[PDB]
Amino acid sequence: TRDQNGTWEMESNENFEGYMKALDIDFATRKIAVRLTQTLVIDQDGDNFKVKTTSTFRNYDVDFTVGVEFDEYTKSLDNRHVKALVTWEGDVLVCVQKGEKENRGWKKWIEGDKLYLELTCGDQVCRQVFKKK
Numbered sequence: 704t705r706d707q708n709g710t711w712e713m714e715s716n717e718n719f720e721g722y723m724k725a726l727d728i729d730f731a732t733r734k735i736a737v738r739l740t741q742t743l744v745i746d747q748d749g750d751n752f753k754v755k756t757t758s759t760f761r762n763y764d765v766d767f768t769v770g771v772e773f774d775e776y777t778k779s780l781d782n783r784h785v786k787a788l789v790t791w792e793g794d795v796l797v798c799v800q801k802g803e804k805e806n807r808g809w810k811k812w813i814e815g816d817k818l819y820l821e822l823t824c825g826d827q828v829c830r831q832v833f834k835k836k
């Protein structure tokens with residue numbers, strides 16, 4: 704399904720370290736940053752998304768409209784400029800972040816009562832699974 708609305712609680716986080724290392728996030732930050740408790744709050748109205756990610760480490764909010772390119776300056780992350788675009792491939796929501804890193808972006812989809820998130824950068828893939836709260 705394309706409906707990703709809801710409050711989503713992390714139940715699995717695979718290779719977040721590899722993803723972060725591929726982003727060149729500094730070592731001390733990576734040691735903290737990985738949290739197995741993470742809440743993703745998604746408000747979806749038509750093509751407008753408001754996404755908020757919360758953990759005890761840091762909170763990451765982004766708003767976007769599907770099919771509208773938007774520049775990002777990833778200050779809270781690896782500190783880079785990218786050109787972001789979020790589109791649908793079937794029922795998979797795909798973000799491509801064009802810039803220095805190849806294969807940078809994410810894919811998000813709903814399968815049953817679960818939200819799946821694949822974060823990619825370079826040859827690294829991080830896979831996260833969330834249960835609807």
Ligand SMILES: *C/C=C(C)/C=C/C=C(C)/C=C/C1=C(C)CCCC1(C)C
Nearest residue numbers: 736754756760761763765779780811
């Ligand atoms: C639709 C889902 C989206 C837009 C999620 C994107 C999430 C991130 C870019 C999250 C990054 C981080 C954490 C979840 C932990 C805190 C540190 C970050 C920034 C690496």
